[PDB]
Design an enzyme around this catalytic site. Structure first.
Site, PDB file in Angstrom:
ATOM      1  N   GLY A  95     -22.855  39.361 -10.495  1.00 36.17           N
ATOM      2  CA  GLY A  95     -23.168  39.841  -9.147  1.00 36.17           C
ATOM      3  C   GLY A  95     -24.666  39.983  -8.948  1.00 36.17           C
ATOM      4  O   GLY A  95     -25.435  39.152  -9.429  1.00 36.17           O
ATOM      5  N   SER A  96     -25.075  41.045  -8.258  1.00 34.59           N
ATOM      6  CA  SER A  96     -26.468  41.234  -7.821  1.00 34.59           C
ATOM      7  C   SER A  96     -27.521  41.226  -8.926  1.00 34.59           C
ATOM      8  O   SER A  96     -28.689  40.889  -8.674  1.00 34.59           O
ATOM      9  CB  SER A  96     -26.602  42.536  -7.033  1.00 34.59           C
ATOM     10  N   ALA A  97     -27.126  41.591 -10.139  1.00 32.39           N
ATOM     11  CA  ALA A  97     -28.054  41.593 -11.273  1.00 32.39           C
ATOM     12  C   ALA A  97     -28.673  40.228 -11.545  1.00 32.39           C
ATOM     13  O   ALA A  97     -29.682  40.138 -12.244  1.00 32.39           O
ATOM     14  CB  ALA A  97     -27.361  42.102 -12.530  1.00 32.39           C
ATOM     15  N   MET A  98     -28.065  39.173 -11.012  1.00 28.21           N
ATOM     16  CA  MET A  98     -28.568  37.811 -11.178  1.00 28.21           C
ATOM     17  C   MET A  98     -29.634  37.446 -10.138  1.00 28.21           C
ATOM     18  O   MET A  98     -30.420  36.521 -10.336  1.00 28.21           O
ATOM     19  CB  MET A  98     -27.389  36.842 -11.094  1.00 28.21           C
ATOM     20  N   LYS A  99     -29.690  38.191  -9.041  1.00 27.14           N
ATOM     21  CA  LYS A  99     -30.569  37.839  -7.916  1.00 27.14           C
ATOM     22  C   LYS A  99     -32.045  37.718  -8.231  1.00 27.14           C
ATOM     23  O   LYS A  99     -32.708  36.832  -7.696  1.00 27.14           O
ATOM     24  CB  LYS A  99     -30.387  38.825  -6.756  1.00 27.14           C
TER      25      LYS A  99
END
Length: 324
Positions: free
Chosen positions: A60-64
């Protein structure tokens, strides 16, 4: 000797158990890495296998931050560039944000963790370019950490992607990696653009990094990620008193559980501090919280905050600003 610090391990253990009990969750994991060596300072799981290394998730967002980093590193965009961040279509599929903004600059895309913004940054690049970047961060590749059952995660060949897949990958769905792989990828941000190996043994010689982005880019991305833990950001639950903290939080997804198929929501928080000159990376996951909050930030932020704060205290790092 082991690289693990028993005081950090003990702190991590107590804070994880407190959260898992309070949120009546199924499982959880904390990883703490030395931000400049890749040594594991703490690694704890709820009882059972070493989920930190064996279990892959869609992050999820941790990859952004990585798509943002790639975009800045290319020279194609600047942190002040503005994008249209309204929801849009790829065939029948919709890309949309939790809270809608008509436009955001790159700083805002980070601050608000915008799926739309991140996907548009990714869309400036070819499938091959994004795949090669994700591969270089270690997605789908074996760390060879020394742990048995270490997953490589999942990164489908770009030669088979749909446009929607490239988009979803930019905001952390459609590829998979372990919490330890995720923590490792964050060394690109903390170790000035160079990916470090992970180890649980006390280092005898300095590790050789592999350059993924420029040092100047890594520094800029760290600056931007502080906005996440400040007022207006999605990660204020993980703010640490006396320090600037770069972090991301989001709901990850678990599609495999040991050797079996699964489907679970996983609350996540990952970050580093002090943001300008990071000493540690702390990563937290809590599987299927069922009480006192389902929002990622409220579930895992307080554990991140306590583990990060405590670790900096234990390592003797002075606060960079007065406490509130």
């Amino acid at each position: 000797a082991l690289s693990l610090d028993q005081r950090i391990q003990t702190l991590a253990y107590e804070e994880l158990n407190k959260a898992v009990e309070y949120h009546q969750a199924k499982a959880g994991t904390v990883v703490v890495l030395d931000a400049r060596t890749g040594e594991i300072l703490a690694l704890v799981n709820t009882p059972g296998r070493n989920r930190a290394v064996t279990d892959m998730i869609e992050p999820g967002s941790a990859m952004k931050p990585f798509t943002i980093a790639k975009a800045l590193d290319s020279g194609k965009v600047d942190a002040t560039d503005t994008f249209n961040t309204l929801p849009y279509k790829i065939g029948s599929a919709t890309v949309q944000d939790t809270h809608v903004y008509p436009t955001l600059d790159v700083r805002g895309i980070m601050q608000k963790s915008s799926n739309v913004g991140t996907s548009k940054l990714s869309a400036m690049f070819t499938p091959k370019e994004m795949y090669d970047f994700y591969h270089d961060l270690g997605v789908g590749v074996r760390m060879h950490s020394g742990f048995p059952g270490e997953t490589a995660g999942l990164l489908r060949s770009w030669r088979r992607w749909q446009k929607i897949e490239q988009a979803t990958m930019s905001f952390g769905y459609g590829l998979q990696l372990s919490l330890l792989q995720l923590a490792r990828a964050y060394t690109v941000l903390t170790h000035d653009g160079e990916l470090l190996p992970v180890s649980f043994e006390k280092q005898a010689v300095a590790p050789k990094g592999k350059r993924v982005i420029k040092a100047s880019t890594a520094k800029k991305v760290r600056e931007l990620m502080v906005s996440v833990t400040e007022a207006g950001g999605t990660g204020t639950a993980g703010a640490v008193d006396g320090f600037d903290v770069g972090a991301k939080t989001g709901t990850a997804r678990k599609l495999v559980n040991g050797r079996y198929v699964d489907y679970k929501h996983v609350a996540t928080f990952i970050g580093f501090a002090p943001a300008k000159n990071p000493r540690v990376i702390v990563a937290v996951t809590i599987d299927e919280p069922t009480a006192n909050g389902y929002y990622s930030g409220v579930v895992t932020g307080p554990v991140f905050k306590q583990v990060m704060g405590g670790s900096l205290n234990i390592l003797g790092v002075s606060p960079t600003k007065p406490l509130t």
